[model samples]
Target chain A: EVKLEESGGGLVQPGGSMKLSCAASGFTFSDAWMDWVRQSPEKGLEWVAEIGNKGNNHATYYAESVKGRFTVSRDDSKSRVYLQMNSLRVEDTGTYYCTTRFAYWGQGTLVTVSAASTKGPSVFPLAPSSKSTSGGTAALGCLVKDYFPEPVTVSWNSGALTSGVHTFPAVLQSSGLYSLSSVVTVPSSSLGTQTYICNVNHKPSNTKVDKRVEPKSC
Target chain B: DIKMTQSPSSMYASLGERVTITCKASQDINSYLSWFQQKPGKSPKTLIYRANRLVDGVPSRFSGSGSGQDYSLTISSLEYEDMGIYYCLQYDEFPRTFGGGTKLEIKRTVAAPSVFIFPPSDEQLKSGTASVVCLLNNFYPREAKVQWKVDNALQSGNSQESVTEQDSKDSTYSLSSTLTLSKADYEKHKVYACEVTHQGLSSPVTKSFNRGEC
Candidate 1:
């Protein structure tokens, strides 16, 4: 008997807004595709996307990778199976999982996001960019996980000559797992247009660069 | 659309560790069913989606009855960051299926709750400062007790925050808390929590922040 189910509604408050449901029986929920994940107890497994049964869905919100809060309705007269996630907060917390039966696994509960205070996590700014090849030794590219911001620091300029790149931290698979990376090298010498910068020293800071990077053959 | 189950993969609810997560449904989704809570990296936060219906500001002590194919997502007591990892999702079935997680730990004298988060940035709400951290693991003398709440009160005074315990004893417990203010507290601060107590798994978990504005 293939099964997949879930139940939640604990903690509360933190911005208030929740809805967790996942139901699947021994069969037919369209036969598979219902995927939803968010883990951290043991580690690894944070997709938070996928759902297909006509109710069509896909999510992990922010801007993209979402289709509609993961939903799938069915009663096909009497063959229940559902998955809903509406308006929730506390970063929508975690533990909301479902994997299209057997595929959607099933079994997890602790929906406690009693979100009390500290709310502000969505920073952006990693415009690391530099290009000076008059003499060479200048390279910059800060995609450091896009927009950069991790314990911060990514400086390598040549305007007056600045140096940065010393970090030690790591973790990332999503669900907000730890992540890290650090690199800085600058001997920039263009003498004519030497201007390089890649700063993102953050905690509440911001700075993006790379308004120009010219030095392909020269 | 209910199908839940709980085994021995994990246990140690201490502080009223009455464990139970058995949601069944292979032929009777007769209650809708919903229950969530994820700690590790943080993301699945709907403490009860539909099964019993109760999401808006959760905390009545937490409750959710069962029905049809059997359902149950209870936690009257069981704190200590509530440990982490717990799932159950079945909106009667679609692409929603989770239930392979359950590690709400804190067994004998060990600490394990390392959240460490940082996901807000509209420029930290247009320059005003922003903060995030929920680290706690293995349990040690980092002295445990890092808080910064919004729903249960608390608010600040982490002394800088901490929950260290690693580099041995297998290595894991690594508590840490920090959720700065201002920047409008991200729009008048409604929910930006981070709770973690000590003394062998204090059982204080709070993660909320409305999903991606909107």
Candidate 2:
């Protein structure tokens, strides 16, 4: 039962830098490769970086998504792995996990990247529309806009509909802010009385907004 | 890696209409492009490779062409079965990249031809009689015919064909034809065939059977 202890998390300013820690135990530290992964508020998981060390030698591999922005280091004596992200962007707000073989993973820690005066997202549930009527599958979209520090997690209640959700990358407005849009698919039969709640978690102001929507009966 | 960009992300085409989809690479790829067709919930099927080389068994109407950064997939005459999403893949660099994908849609669509041969029951063969059945599915316009051939000779005995049945879901048609022959006659022929002739096909799709072969 290999175990890991995590620290060094929380908020960071845009253009600033931050460091995270994962203390390892229950196995030979230097004999195994340590890895770090990131999960977007949208719940999409991406490999951040990996590090392998033996005595005085070490090698690191960075995922293309975070190749230039992330650096991984290991301290054999302390049995701890460190992650440093430089020139952080608002999109960097998410949960980060550490693991060895990924079979047993460290509990994720949330990090918010935003400015001191940044505001949380304004969430609104999109009304049922006939725009998407493909093969009896109805669509429900949520607009999370006018947010500072671009990262926001949008999720649906029950059912694994995250994959069906079409979430576009954050779009920057002329006002130097970002907005997000996501659409989820629901069965047409659940329109009249079927209600699914959408939760938009915006960390800048630590705001969690819940909106319930029911599609009009077909 | 070369970046692939496909235009007209989605489009609608009619039966017998000429349809064309194009992909452009960020740089010259030396004609290292391939096209794929994907249906909902199904894996992509490679239609053309090396820019313009058609894969075996694919219809000739689907052709590929162009060089360097500019390549295109053209269907000379679109059929109902041709409606689906298509993607372009480039293998000129270390990491291959694909286009955003193009979806082809048809109004009042028709599907292509497919042939399926059912195996004969052992009891029937043991009873000194057997009936061979061939089912043609997903063909549209519904004016198609089936022909049974045995060892290069068309069958004339105990053969019956049916009219196409229009279905609600998927908007396609299904047709079946059966051939009845004695065990002696089945042994007489080394090869049996079910040939489907349709308006959408340049040539008939022939499914064959043989003695003790289902």
Candidate 3:
């Protein structure tokens, strides 16, 4: 719950959904369109979505307006307007604030969807000698490096032939980070396999996209 | 905030080979910029520059395009001669930035049709052991090594396993990997990763559990 009194946040995650609300106290909630922006740690503010207090909403695409899965609705009392999105992603982290067409606005809140982890080395691919792999067997580990409210899932595959997902929740660190870990088996016949994909999908897009790791060929 | 992610962060792609790079902006960059190719241990080369631009010296078959900020970079044709790191940059900004690095690799091309599952489920936090699965099908090449990663670590042993795909070498194929773990491993918060690798390629193609991590 964000109040207009509170300013804003980031891009929506790709193929992901988001639900965030805006509250207005001093001005009429139904008079204007609240705009959303994306602000990264290194980048500045970026415009992403727009929703009017009167039940109108729009998405940003290439310096213009394009619609994906952006929606806007007001509360029963018309005191707060909520913006919901589907299929947003990692590149979508930043501060999001609502503005009455730039005429009036809330301070905006920073929306930073981080990559979840189980507190280990990031899922980077291992190089020759970096990791050992064979056909009938393999050594693999993927834990949630960090997470806040959800668990982690790790999926491994060898070419088109596949196995499944491994899940775990990330632990909290002194660094204040949340994460989890996962592991998989690679088939010997699958050595020098075609493709290896590790996919992690969290609830309420933290603006984190999937983090992956690789194992070097022996 | 809308987040941008690059898969594989580093991979091995053959020269002039067909490779794909995915980039997602937090909000809408309006086709700002796309992915680039870089040699191992070198600066990134703008392949799909500005959401969809093939820099000079690059082939024309290489292309980049997306809708509503959701876009990709593709080499209509790959050379097998080129190998290196590939990345996505933003034309959305004045100075410009990039997504993580991904390695384009050479191999038999497993999981013909690769799908990037954009969100993990609540079950990942449930208990005991769990596994997440992403499905890709209709692979032209035979198989690519699949993996399960949390954040970036490779988990061993899997409890859950599943696959959704049609049986088709030329027709299609679906595949997935399972990251198996126990409740003791739960509690940490991080997304999982699924990577696919082929032979003869330096790097592999990767996809991660997509979700709002911010």
lDDT of 3 by residue, B1-214 (tens): 2467765454444445566667777668877665555442222344554565566566787787886667777766666544555656454543234465565555444334433332333434453444454434335454556776777777666523333222111223334443435555543646666776654345766766433341
Q: Report how far residue A92 has shifted in candidate 1, in Å.
A: 9.6
Candidate 1 lDDT score relative to the true structure: 0.48
Model 3: per-residue Cα lDDT over A1-218, one tens digit each: 22364322332335656677776776555655565444443553345554545544332222232255556555636577666655555555555555443334455555555544323233433211122333334434344444443333455542232443333334444445555544444543544544555555554344333444444322
Provide the lowest-lDDT 10-residue window in model 3 chain B. Answer: B163-172
TM-score of chain B of each: 0.29, 0.52, 0.43
CAPRI-style class, candidate 2: incorrect
Instruction: Give the Å shift of residue A127 in candidate 3.
Output: 24
| Order of models, best lDDT first | 2, 3, 1
Deviation from native of the Cα of residue A169 in model 3, angstroms:
33
RMSD of 2: 24.2
**Over the stretch B87-108, how does candidate 2's per-residue lDDT look in tens digits?**
8877675344668788886656
Q: What is the lDDT of residue B208 in candidate 1?
A: 45
lDDT of 1 at B149: 66
Query: Which parts of model 3 have CA positions greater than 4 angstroms off?
Result: A1-218, B7-18, B94-96, B108-214
Location of the lowest summed lDDT over 10 successive residues in candidate 1 chain B: B162-171
